[PDB]
Amino acid sequence: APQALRENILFGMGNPLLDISAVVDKDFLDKYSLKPNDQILAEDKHKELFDELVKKFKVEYHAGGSTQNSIKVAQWMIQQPHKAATFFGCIGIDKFGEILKRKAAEAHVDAHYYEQNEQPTGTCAACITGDNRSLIANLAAANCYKKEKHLDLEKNWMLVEKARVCYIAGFFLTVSPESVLKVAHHASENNRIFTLNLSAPFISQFYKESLMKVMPYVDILFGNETEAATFAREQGFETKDIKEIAKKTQALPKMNSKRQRIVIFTQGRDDTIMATESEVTAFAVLIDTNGAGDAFVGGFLSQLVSDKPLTECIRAGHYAASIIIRRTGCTFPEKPDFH
Amino acid sequence: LRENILFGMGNPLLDISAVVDKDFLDKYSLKPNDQILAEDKHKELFDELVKKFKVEYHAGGSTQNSIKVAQWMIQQPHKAATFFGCIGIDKFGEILKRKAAEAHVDAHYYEQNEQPTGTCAACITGDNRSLIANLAAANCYKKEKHLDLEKNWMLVEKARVCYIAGFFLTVSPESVLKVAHHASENNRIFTLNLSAPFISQFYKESLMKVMPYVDILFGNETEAATFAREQGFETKDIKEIAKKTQALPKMNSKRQRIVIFTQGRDDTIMATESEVTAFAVLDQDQKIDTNGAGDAFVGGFLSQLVSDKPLTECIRAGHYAASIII
Ligand SMILES: C#Cc1cn([C@@H]2O[C@H](CO)[C@@H](O)[C@H]2O)c2ncnc(N)c12
Ligand SMILES: C#Cc1cn([C@@H]2O[C@H](CO)[C@@H](O)[C@H]2O)c2ncnc(N)c12
Ligand SMILES: C#Cc1cn([C@@H]2O[C@H](CO)[C@@H](O)[C@H]2O)c2ncnc(N)c12
Ligand SMILES: [Mg+2]
Ligand SMILES: [Mg+2]
Ligand SMILES: [Mg+2]
Ligand SMILES: [Mg+2]
């Protein structure tokens, strides 16, 4: 028989961040030795950057966090019911905290946060030049999430049990790999679909212990082309061809053998590459590329909760990425127009 | 070393060896130097060997050999090493049980009656050995009938080092992946052997499923060459194949993979994270069962690795165990 949506069908958890964006200049990038299109975790030498950004530029504020973006876009495309998509994560008790709570509610997402006083809500600097964005994430509160404090409490765990599809960005592996593995194991032992993002090169470089521990449980791996290339370089694939990286990544040991792994790499304007059990194939597309990537996954997830074909999941991803790309931030004044 | 510190599973075989002649090789279209699984065209071969040649009988199976040599070099305690596998309830079965116990190995076999205990025919001509395995009972091993039962699975949990020959990938890749993944989860060392060229040629989907879990890969030079060819490595140099094999996807990043290729009386090649280095074989005999020497090398190596001795002392112990068995 045919599957059909209902509340808490999609589960996501990750770092809830408030994004602080501003058009900067090449000098500001060098002052902090930042590259134009990069995504890094805030080091201690970057502490000055967050004050200087707000002080010296005209900044904007938008709700962010990669998984959180994908879960809002998934909920939008799903449309009905409200709260089809669940989000968990940790924030501070502060102004930025409350903006985030409000934005998940306006997105009709069933958000359940772990809140605490010690750390302010996490923020992410987006320093823009041309069509480049240089992201620096200051996780703060987001880095305080603990399974025992939140995910394990039975009120919250119940909602993960409702889920048919789980999505967690690789980014969250820097904070609570124990939480990611508990959802991962659960998905495996109850034949639910578990899905992950490579998220950023630094995850494959510096967080591969958590990444490769979870990979055997990953039903669908998403990512973009530099992430794939960093992953291939780091895991000794001895190739640069995206299609060959998708194929070797697809064939990695897998726990739940009742589902073959699917691997999807988006490529900006280049074609989106999908590796299944039996082939690797390109799909052409038809500027926040980072956000477009998150929206692609939200589009894809939006159809995967219904068990639609993989082609239709890809086409929905491409559709959500083109829409959200034009409107900055996570609001949706229009309704999806996808058939 | 406590009891059950080293875990092994594989195909328990009784080896039936004899010096044969060229006619026998030709009759069964055998490679003078090879290791194959018995196909239908080989059914008659095992009877004809026993009947027409002067055969000898020894307890065998690659992993089983390595585990016995490991227990011997470890010495204490008795039952430092565990072995799982499947046999028949028959004469050859009982010889194997007896030999493991005399070896002080904690062998927990799955015994059943539909298939006889597996045998391996070693057909010698000159310095050539042509091995043909009739796995039989060995091939009946099933995780659900044995490995999964909690009294056996408990013994795998005791293990700090696991060793499985790639041979066992033809039989139960499900069992190998369960031990493999378990070692990874609990940062226990998981080790595997390339075992023979036919593993890479015909079971590479299973081989490459498990390779990410392999903390130490062992093998000889032809296995390394077959592996590089089948993996499209391009290079044929043993030191280079060791290096690219070392750098392959790895699921437990707490341990950098080590790759050891033996090469007969040539040097043993070892590739770690940061270098590849040759270690010579000092003590030379004339005349040799390289296959059995290879198994013994791994037993020697494992014997020191359960104590967390340096890699150089593991290798020296391997070279030492090989020269004894020769
Ligand atoms: C760096 C970085 C990050 C950027 N992002 C998100 O990338 C989104 C654009 O796709 C931004 O909204 C930012 O919050 C992260 N989300 C969770 N954890 C992270 N470490 C990051
Ligand atoms: C062929 C072969 C095999 C040879 N051997 C063993 O290799 C030892 C020589 O090192 C012999 O004792 C043979 O039984 C195998 N053991 C497990 N599975 C196998 N398929 C084989
Ligand atoms: C052939 C052979 C030899 C193998 N070995 C040992 O057995 C291992 C398995 O091939 C070799 O790496 C070596 O340690 C020898 N040791 C001393 N003299 C030898 N001729 C050999
Ligand atoms: Mg996230
Ligand atoms: Mg992205
Ligand atoms: Mg074996
Ligand atoms: Mg060998």
JSON list of N, CA, C and O in Angstrom, two decimals, chain B residues 228-254:
[
{"chain": "B", "resi": 228, "resn": "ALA", "atom": "N", "xyz": [45.56, -5.16, -5.65]},
{"chain": "B", "resi": 228, "resn": "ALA", "atom": "CA", "xyz": [45.80, -3.92, -6.44]},
{"chain": "B", "resi": 228, "resn": "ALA", "atom": "C", "xyz": [45.21, -3.99, -7.86]},
{"chain": "B", "resi": 228, "resn": "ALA", "atom": "O", "xyz": [44.57, -3.06, -8.34]},
{"chain": "B", "resi": 229, "resn": "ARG", "atom": "N", "xyz": [45.39, -5.09, -8.56]},
{"chain": "B", "resi": 229, "resn": "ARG", "atom": "CA", "xyz": [44.84, -5.17, -9.92]},
{"chain": "B", "resi": 229, "resn": "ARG", "atom": "C", "xyz": [43.32, -5.01, -9.84]},
{"chain": "B", "resi": 229, "resn": "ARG", "atom": "O", "xyz": [42.78, -4.09, -10.44]},
{"chain": "B", "resi": 230, "resn": "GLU", "atom": "N", "xyz": [42.66, -5.85, -9.05]},
{"chain": "B", "resi": 230, "resn": "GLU", "atom": "CA", "xyz": [41.18, -5.82, -8.92]},
{"chain": "B", "resi": 230, "resn": "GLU", "atom": "C", "xyz": [40.64, -4.49, -8.37]},
{"chain": "B", "resi": 230, "resn": "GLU", "atom": "O", "xyz": [39.52, -4.13, -8.64]},
{"chain": "B", "resi": 231, "resn": "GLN", "atom": "N", "xyz": [41.43, -3.78, -7.57]},
{"chain": "B", "resi": 231, "resn": "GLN", "atom": "CA", "xyz": [41.03, -2.45, -7.09]},
{"chain": "B", "resi": 231, "resn": "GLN", "atom": "C", "xyz": [41.40, -1.32, -8.04]},
{"chain": "B", "resi": 231, "resn": "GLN", "atom": "O", "xyz": [41.24, -0.17, -7.68]},
{"chain": "B", "resi": 232, "resn": "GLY", "atom": "N", "xyz": [41.94, -1.65, -9.21]},
{"chain": "B", "resi": 232, "resn": "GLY", "atom": "CA", "xyz": [42.45, -0.62, -10.14]},
{"chain": "B", "resi": 232, "resn": "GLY", "atom": "C", "xyz": [43.49, 0.32, -9.55]},
{"chain": "B", "resi": 232, "resn": "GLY", "atom": "O", "xyz": [43.41, 1.52, -9.74]},
{"chain": "B", "resi": 233, "resn": "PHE", "atom": "N", "xyz": [44.48, -0.22, -8.84]},
{"chain": "B", "resi": 233, "resn": "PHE", "atom": "CA", "xyz": [45.55, 0.59, -8.24]},
{"chain": "B", "resi": 233, "resn": "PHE", "atom": "C", "xyz": [46.58, 1.10, -9.22]},
{"chain": "B", "resi": 233, "resn": "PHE", "atom": "O", "xyz": [47.27, 2.11, -8.93]},
{"chain": "B", "resi": 234, "resn": "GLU", "atom": "N", "xyz": [46.69, 0.47, -10.38]},
{"chain": "B", "resi": 234, "resn": "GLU", "atom": "CA", "xyz": [47.66, 0.90, -11.43]},
{"chain": "B", "resi": 234, "resn": "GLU", "atom": "C", "xyz": [49.10, 0.50, -11.13]},
{"chain": "B", "resi": 234, "resn": "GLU", "atom": "O", "xyz": [49.75, -0.17, -11.96]},
{"chain": "B", "resi": 235, "resn": "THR", "atom": "N", "xyz": [49.62, 0.94, -9.99]},
{"chain": "B", "resi": 235, "resn": "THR", "atom": "CA", "xyz": [50.93, 0.48, -9.53]},
{"chain": "B", "resi": 235, "resn": "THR", "atom": "C", "xyz": [50.93, -1.04, -9.26]},
{"chain": "B", "resi": 235, "resn": "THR", "atom": "O", "xyz": [49.88, -1.64, -9.03]},
{"chain": "B", "resi": 236, "resn": "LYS", "atom": "N", "xyz": [52.11, -1.66, -9.38]},
{"chain": "B", "resi": 236, "resn": "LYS", "atom": "CA", "xyz": [52.31, -3.07, -9.08]},
{"chain": "B", "resi": 236, "resn": "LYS", "atom": "C", "xyz": [53.38, -3.26, -7.96]},
{"chain": "B", "resi": 236, "resn": "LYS", "atom": "O", "xyz": [53.56, -4.38, -7.47]},
{"chain": "B", "resi": 237, "resn": "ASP", "atom": "N", "xyz": [54.02, -2.17, -7.53]},
{"chain": "B", "resi": 237, "resn": "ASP", "atom": "CA", "xyz": [55.07, -2.20, -6.52]},
{"chain": "B", "resi": 237, "resn": "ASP", "atom": "C", "xyz": [54.44, -2.47, -5.14]},
{"chain": "B", "resi": 237, "resn": "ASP", "atom": "O", "xyz": [53.50, -1.84, -4.75]},
{"chain": "B", "resi": 238, "resn": "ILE", "atom": "N", "xyz": [55.01, -3.44, -4.43]},
{"chain": "B", "resi": 238, "resn": "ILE", "atom": "CA", "xyz": [54.41, -3.97, -3.23]},
{"chain": "B", "resi": 238, "resn": "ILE", "atom": "C", "xyz": [54.32, -2.88, -2.13]},
{"chain": "B", "resi": 238, "resn": "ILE", "atom": "O", "xyz": [53.30, -2.76, -1.46]},
{"chain": "B", "resi": 239, "resn": "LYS", "atom": "N", "xyz": [55.39, -2.10, -1.99]},
{"chain": "B", "resi": 239, "resn": "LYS", "atom": "CA", "xyz": [55.45, -1.00, -1.03]},
{"chain": "B", "resi": 239, "resn": "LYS", "atom": "C", "xyz": [54.39, 0.05, -1.34]},
{"chain": "B", "resi": 239, "resn": "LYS", "atom": "O", "xyz": [53.83, 0.64, -0.44]},
{"chain": "B", "resi": 240, "resn": "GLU", "atom": "N", "xyz": [54.10, 0.26, -2.61]},
{"chain": "B", "resi": 240, "resn": "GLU", "atom": "CA", "xyz": [53.09, 1.23, -3.02]},
{"chain": "B", "resi": 240, "resn": "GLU", "atom": "C", "xyz": [51.67, 0.71, -2.80]},
{"chain": "B", "resi": 240, "resn": "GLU", "atom": "O", "xyz": [50.78, 1.46, -2.43]},
{"chain": "B", "resi": 241, "resn": "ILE", "atom": "N", "xyz": [51.46, -0.58, -3.05]},
{"chain": "B", "resi": 241, "resn": "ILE", "atom": "CA", "xyz": [50.16, -1.23, -2.80]},
{"chain": "B", "resi": 241, "resn": "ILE", "atom": "C", "xyz": [49.82, -1.26, -1.32]},
{"chain": "B", "resi": 241, "resn": "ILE", "atom": "O", "xyz": [48.70, -1.04, -0.93]},
{"chain": "B", "resi": 242, "resn": "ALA", "atom": "N", "xyz": [50.80, -1.53, -0.49]},
{"chain": "B", "resi": 242, "resn": "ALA", "atom": "CA", "xyz": [50.67, -1.45, 0.96]},
{"chain": "B", "resi": 242, "resn": "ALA", "atom": "C", "xyz": [50.19, -0.06, 1.40]},
{"chain": "B", "resi": 242, "resn": "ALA", "atom": "O", "xyz": [49.30, 0.06, 2.27]},
{"chain": "B", "resi": 243, "resn": "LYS", "atom": "N", "xyz": [50.81, 0.98, 0.83]},
{"chain": "B", "resi": 243, "resn": "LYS", "atom": "CA", "xyz": [50.50, 2.39, 1.14]},
{"chain": "B", "resi": 243, "resn": "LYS", "atom": "C", "xyz": [49.07, 2.80, 0.74]},
{"chain": "B", "resi": 243, "resn": "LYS", "atom": "O", "xyz": [48.33, 3.40, 1.53]},
{"chain": "B", "resi": 244, "resn": "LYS", "atom": "N", "xyz": [48.67, 2.48, -0.49]},
{"chain": "B", "resi": 244, "resn": "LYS", "atom": "CA", "xyz": [47.32, 2.80, -0.90]},
{"chain": "B", "resi": 244, "resn": "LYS", "atom": "C", "xyz": [46.30, 1.96, -0.16]},
{"chain": "B", "resi": 244, "resn": "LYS", "atom": "O", "xyz": [45.20, 2.39, 0.07]},
{"chain": "B", "resi": 245, "resn": "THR", "atom": "N", "xyz": [46.66, 0.73, 0.20]},
{"chain": "B", "resi": 245, "resn": "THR", "atom": "CA", "xyz": [45.74, -0.12, 0.94]},
{"chain": "B", "resi": 245, "resn": "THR", "atom": "C", "xyz": [45.60, 0.43, 2.35]},
{"chain": "B", "resi": 245, "resn": "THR", "atom": "O", "xyz": [44.50, 0.47, 2.91]},
{"chain": "B", "resi": 246, "resn": "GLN", "atom": "N", "xyz": [46.71, 0.88, 2.91]},
{"chain": "B", "resi": 246, "resn": "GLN", "atom": "CA", "xyz": [46.68, 1.48, 4.24]},
{"chain": "B", "resi": 246, "resn": "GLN", "atom": "C", "xyz": [45.71, 2.68, 4.30]},
{"chain": "B", "resi": 246, "resn": "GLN", "atom": "O", "xyz": [45.09, 2.92, 5.34]},
{"chain": "B", "resi": 247, "resn": "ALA", "atom": "N", "xyz": [45.57, 3.43, 3.21]},
{"chain": "B", "resi": 247, "resn": "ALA", "atom": "CA", "xyz": [44.89, 4.74, 3.29]},
{"chain": "B", "resi": 247, "resn": "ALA", "atom": "C", "xyz": [43.40, 4.63, 3.00]},
{"chain": "B", "resi": 247, "resn": "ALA", "atom": "O", "xyz": [42.72, 5.64, 2.93]},
{"chain": "B", "resi": 248, "resn": "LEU", "atom": "N", "xyz": [42.91, 3.41, 2.85]},
{"chain": "B", "resi": 248, "resn": "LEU", "atom": "CA", "xyz": [41.50, 3.15, 2.46]},
{"chain": "B", "resi": 248, "resn": "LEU", "atom": "C", "xyz": [40.52, 3.56, 3.53]},
{"chain": "B", "resi": 248, "resn": "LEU", "atom": "O", "xyz": [40.86, 3.56, 4.72]},
{"chain": "B", "resi": 249, "resn": "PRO", "atom": "N", "xyz": [39.28, 3.84, 3.13]},
{"chain": "B", "resi": 249, "resn": "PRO", "atom": "CA", "xyz": [38.26, 4.26, 4.08]},
{"chain": "B", "resi": 249, "resn": "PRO", "atom": "C", "xyz": [38.35, 3.49, 5.37]},
{"chain": "B", "resi": 249, "resn": "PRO", "atom": "O", "xyz": [38.63, 2.29, 5.32]},
{"chain": "B", "resi": 250, "resn": "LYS", "atom": "N", "xyz": [38.19, 4.18, 6.52]},
{"chain": "B", "resi": 250, "resn": "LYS", "atom": "CA", "xyz": [38.31, 3.53, 7.83]},
{"chain": "B", "resi": 250, "resn": "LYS", "atom": "C", "xyz": [37.22, 4.00, 8.80]},
{"chain": "B", "resi": 250, "resn": "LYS", "atom": "O", "xyz": [37.03, 5.19, 9.02]},
{"chain": "B", "resi": 251, "resn": "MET", "atom": "N", "xyz": [36.53, 3.05, 9.39]},
{"chain": "B", "resi": 251, "resn": "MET", "atom": "CA", "xyz": [35.31, 3.34, 10.18]},
{"chain": "B", "resi": 251, "resn": "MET", "atom": "C", "xyz": [35.59, 3.70, 11.65]},
{"chain": "B", "resi": 251, "resn": "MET", "atom": "O", "xyz": [34.80, 4.41, 12.26]},
{"chain": "B", "resi": 252, "resn": "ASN", "atom": "N", "xyz": [36.65, 3.14, 12.21]},
{"chain": "B", "resi": 252, "resn": "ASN", "atom": "CA", "xyz": [37.24, 3.53, 13.49]},
{"chain": "B", "resi": 252, "resn": "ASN", "atom": "C", "xyz": [38.51, 4.32, 13.30]},
{"chain": "B", "resi": 252, "resn": "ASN", "atom": "O", "xyz": [39.57, 3.78, 13.01]},
{"chain": "B", "resi": 253, "resn": "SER", "atom": "N", "xyz": [38.41, 5.62, 13.53]},
{"chain": "B", "resi": 253, "resn": "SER", "atom": "CA", "xyz": [39.49, 6.55, 13.30]},
{"chain": "B", "resi": 253, "resn": "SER", "atom": "C", "xyz": [40.42, 6.64, 14.50]},
{"chain": "B", "resi": 253, "resn": "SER", "atom": "O", "xyz": [41.37, 7.36, 14.44]},
{"chain": "B", "resi": 254, "resn": "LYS", "atom": "N", "xyz": [40.13, 5.93, 15.59]},
{"chain": "B", "resi": 254, "resn": "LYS", "atom": "CA", "xyz": [41.02, 5.90, 16.78]},
{"chain": "B", "resi": 254, "resn": "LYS", "atom": "C", "xyz": [42.30, 5.06, 16.51]},
{"chain": "B", "resi": 254, "resn": "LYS", "atom": "O", "xyz": [43.26, 5.09, 17.28]}
]
